[PDB]
């Protein structure tokens, strides 16, 4: 099979800056006819792949001028001349000149923007959940950069680590920020046992945690 090697595996690019993505072939991608069938795709978060560049260098109806392809035979390059916020996602090369048709491993392109502190919200468990014997306290760190963030949960001023599930969003298409939710899940009985519920974000924008609490 034709092995497609993609470089780099991940790239962090500032807005307006240039980015190059390499794609190398284990066999020559020149067909007998004698076109070179190397295609580039962008897969945006939660979306299916979109064709950017076909047959090495042809830019596909709708694709901005900022995207370009070059290369020959075995060595191929996608270029984004000026990085925009919406260019987030995973870039893939296809060969279709040899069967089996094979893809590159992907290049995750992330946008490097100015630092941003999170906006923190805490949400008590809903009445509808409490009615069914469960209690999830959710907390909710909106629009940081960068991605690295720590959350600590406190019940009555004492740290809790059991029953915590953390999850991030994908970087945002317009402001280039991340979000994450931390969810402490208890039973109704255990939730009704305690009063103070506290979450705190430390993030590199501040050495001091942004603290949010409710009492019930």
């Amino acid at each position: 099979d034709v092995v497609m090697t993609q470089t780099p595996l991940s790239l962090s690019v500032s807005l307006g800056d240039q980015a190059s993505i390499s794609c190398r072939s284990s066999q020559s991608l020149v067909h007998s006819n004698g076109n070179t069938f190397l295609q580039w795709y962008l897969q945006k978060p939660g979306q299916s792949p979109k064709l950017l560049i076909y047959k090495v260098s042809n830019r596909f109806s709708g694709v901005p001028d900022r995207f370009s392809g070059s290369g020959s035979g075995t060595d191929f390059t996608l270029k984004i001349s000026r990085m925009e916020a919406e260019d987030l996602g995973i870039y893939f090369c296809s060969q279709t000149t040899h069967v089996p048709w094979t893809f590159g491993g992907g290049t995750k392109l992330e946008i490097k923007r100015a630092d941003a502190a999170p906006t923190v919200s805490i949400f008590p468990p809903s009445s509808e959940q409490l009615t069914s014997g469960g209690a999830s306290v959710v907390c909710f760190l909106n629009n940081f950069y960068p991605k690295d963030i720590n959350v600590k949960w406190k019940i009555d001023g004492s740290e809790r680590q059991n029953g915590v599930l953390n999850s991030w969003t994908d970087q945002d298409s317009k402001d280039s920020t991340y979000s994450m939710s931390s969810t402490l899940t208890l039973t109704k009985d255990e939730y009704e046992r305690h009063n103070s519920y506290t979450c705190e974000a430390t993030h590199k924008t501040s050495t001091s945690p942004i603290v949010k609490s409710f009492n019930r």
């Binding site: 792949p49 979109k50 064709l51 047959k55 296809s94 979000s179």
Partner: protein
Amino acid sequence: QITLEESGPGILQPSQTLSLTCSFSGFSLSSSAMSVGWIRQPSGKGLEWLAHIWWNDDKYYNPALKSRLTVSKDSSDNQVFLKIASVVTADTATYYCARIPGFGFDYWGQGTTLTVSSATTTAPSVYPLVPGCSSVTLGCLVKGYFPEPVTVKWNYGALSSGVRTVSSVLQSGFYSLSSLVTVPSSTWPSQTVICNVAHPASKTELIKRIEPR
């Protein structure tokens, strides 16, 4: 208006046959040059070409899967089909069909997610995030469900700016996520804010109004 749309069971038990359909419009097979292909992607992993059928009935298969795969078409119904025999856990993936004019893949349908599991399908429970019960952040939390995926929308899709939906988390055989929107204060609660949560595998279409107290 080129479009492609795939459909599958969502969930399937090990060893049974997977039947996928690709429905399309804007082009015809039997129109010449003209092919539809099948590609799969396991979660957070690479793309794998599976098969494609041309307008002349020429069929091409991935050697690593060939003897389990069967492409066919119905050009009059604008449909392409893929059969995968005796399915295993590794067949869990999002499946795409895509049009091939020449050369590649251009479009690309939405994908259909398939999970190979012996487990019951379980619909989600959906709960307010209310603060707490200039701009205000509200959400919907989205627990208990199997298999993937869930679709979350706000105001039937009319509210799309300010939406942040975190990726799912698997724990104790069930997935969960939360989706939040930041509106304007003026906004809510003076105007209606609703989350729409769809879980196709359980045929679930539920709705949560975000109420204050």
